[PDB]
Amino acid sequence: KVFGRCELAAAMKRHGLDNYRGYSLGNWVCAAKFQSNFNTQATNRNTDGSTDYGILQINSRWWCNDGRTPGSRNLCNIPCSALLSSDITASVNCAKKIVSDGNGMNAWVAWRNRCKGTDVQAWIRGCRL
Numbered sequence: 781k782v783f784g785r786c787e788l789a790a791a792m793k794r795h796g797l798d799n800y801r802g803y804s805l806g807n808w809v810c811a812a813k814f815q816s817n818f819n820t821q822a823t824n825r826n827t828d829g830s831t832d833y834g835i836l837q838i839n840s841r842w843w844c845n846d847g848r849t850p851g852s853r854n855l856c857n858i859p860c861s862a863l864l865s866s867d868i869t870a871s872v873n874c875a876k877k878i879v880s881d882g883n884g885m886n887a888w889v890a891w892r893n894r895c896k897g898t899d900v901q902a903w904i905r906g907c908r909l
């Protein structure tokens with residue numbers, strides 16, 4: 781699934797991400813854009829052999845199990861493939877845990893480099909929310 785911008789904002793809002801740990805909805809939409817281009821099937825390989833999965837590019841190094849990242853964790857207790865579903869419930873539920881893990885949204889490398897300190901409310905411009 782490739783989500784639309786407001787489509788994803790609405791899904792993220794329904795699922796409770798708006799102001800979750802003080803991160804307004806625009807932060808989440810900005811992160812998803814630069815990490816996956818809003819594509820639930822997105823995957824990427826890290827230098828260490830881990831793989832990032834889904835709309836929020838959740839790293840198998842820490843958060844999900846793919847059977848091929850020796851030494852890794854599965855802190856969201858899900859198969860990484862579940863993070864590729866058209867239903868974002870798994871990804872959002874897992875994201876809530878990631879953002880609460882100490883570094884806030886700095887966990888998303890694209891958020892820190894491209895979203896942090898910028899006018900993120902612009903990512904939900906026009907949405908019926």
Ligand SMILES: CC(=O)N[C@@H]1[C@@H](O)[C@H](O[C@@H]2O[C@H](CO)[C@@H](O[C@@H]3O[C@H](CO)[C@@H](O[C@@H]4O[C@H](CO)[C@@H](O[C@@H]5O[C@H](CO)[C@@H](O)[C@H](O)[C@H]5NC(C)=O)[C@H](O)[C@H]4NC(C)=O)[C@H](O)[C@H]3NC(C)=O)[C@H](O)[C@H]2NC(C)=O)[C@@H](CO)O[C@H]1O
Nearest residue numbers: 826827832836837838839841842881882883887888889890
């Ligand atoms: C090629 C490429 O660029 N790929 C990227 C990919 O890297 C991106 O995925 C992200 O990867 C990074 C690096 O692997 C992940 O960042 C990890 O995440 C760890 C888990 O949250 C994090 O560990 C946590 O660190 C906290 C802060 O230090 C710990 O809490 C603190 O512990 C202190 C001392 O130990 C203690 O004194 C404090 O009380 C406490 N501080 C606070 C504020 O609470 C916490 O314990 C620890 N958690 C665990 C479970 O061990 C690492 O710090 C962090 N590494 C970094 C920043 O280098 C990140 O999670 C991945 N993101 C996602 C969404 O999966 C990917 C997505 O951005 O993009 C690809 O393109």
